[PDB]
Amino acid sequence: GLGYGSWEIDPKDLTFLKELGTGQFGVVKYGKWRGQYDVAIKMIKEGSMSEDEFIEEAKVMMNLSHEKLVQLYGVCTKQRPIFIITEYMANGCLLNYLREMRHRFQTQQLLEMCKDVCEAMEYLESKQFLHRDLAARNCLVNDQGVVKVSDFGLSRYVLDDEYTSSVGSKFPVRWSPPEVLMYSKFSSKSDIWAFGVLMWEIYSLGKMPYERFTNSETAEHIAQGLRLYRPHLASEKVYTIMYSCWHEKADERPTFKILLSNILDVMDEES
Numbered sequence: 001g002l003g004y005g006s007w008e009i010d011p012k013d014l015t016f017l018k019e020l021g022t023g024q025f026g027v028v029k030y031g032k033w034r035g036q037y038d039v040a041i042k043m044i045k046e047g048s049m050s051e052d053e054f055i056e057e058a059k060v061m062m063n064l065s066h067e068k069l070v071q072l073y074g075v076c077t078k079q080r081p082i083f084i085i086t087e088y089m090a091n092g093c094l095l096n097y098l099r100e101m102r103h104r105f106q107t108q109q110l111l112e113m114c115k116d117v118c119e120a121m122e123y124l125e126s127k128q129f130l131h132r133d134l135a136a137r138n139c140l141v142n143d144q145g146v147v148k149v150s151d152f153g154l155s156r157y158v159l160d161d162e163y164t165s166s167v168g169s170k171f172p173v174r175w176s177p178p179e180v181l182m183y184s185k186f187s188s189k190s191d192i193w194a195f196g197v198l199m200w201e202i203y204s205l206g207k208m209p210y211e212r213f214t215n216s217e218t219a220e221h222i223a224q225g226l227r228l229y230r231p232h233l234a235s236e237k238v239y240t241i242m243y244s245c246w247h248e249k250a251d252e253r254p255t256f257k258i259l260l261s262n263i264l265d266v267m268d269e270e271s
């Protein structure tokens, strides 16, 4: 309506239903838009984000649309805190979901979770859009058990204290390739590296990568050319896929298109 750009939601159209707790970079609620449509509403605390830059990027993020990407519906920026309005993912954080032993997951389910994320990332790669902080902690799960990628690109707008507070370190060392840790060289291939770590997290039912090491120790380990090793639930073929993401040379790592092909091949063999 009058006063709103295509990227802007009128917060008066929101009904708040449940508090979902403190999420990445803000408090999150479940509600409805215009009475009928489920949404999540992420409230961005004053001082936590480069807001004008974020708002400009939200216009681009609105046009990203894929079944395995948490949809950004719009933002509410005429008040503080600003709101991010998104697809609602009823079953919450992937890491919490993996860690609930009651689910008694089959490996076919764990592979499907990998495939969901791979499809989302193949889409982003096709749009030359880097995630920049891919990890199980920002994948969500819907009421149908579908995993979707969230918080894509958002780390670019987080000011230092909020990032540290929400992630638990200045930086996602455990999901970073050598060229990032050494030289800050981000690329599609740093997203590939992170994807392999995420596959490891899925097949390890939500263990912390390098679980006995500090971040400092992890960076040294990766510097020495050493790697995560095989989760017990991963077959040799699955381990080969995740391990391919960790080549010391970025140009020797696969693309998301190749990963998807590899994952489908294992699904067909392990059917």
Ligand SMILES: */C(C)=C\C(=O)N1CC[C@@H](n2c(=O)n(-c3ccc(Oc4ccccc4)cc3)c3c(N)ncnc32)C1
Pocket: 020, 021, 022, 023, 024, 028, 040, 041, 042, 070, 071, 072, 084, 086, 087, 088, 089, 090, 092, 093, 094, 095, 136, 137, 138, 139, 140, 150, 151, 152, 154
């Ligand atoms: C677990 C992975 C995250 C977490 O901290 N949770 C507590 C609240 C609950 N939760 C959400 O955080 N989100 C969610 C994530 C991201 C956004 O914003 C956004 C999406 C896409 C691109 C950029 C920014 C909004 C909300 C939830 C959603 N969507 N539904 C259900 N619970 C959510 C998990």
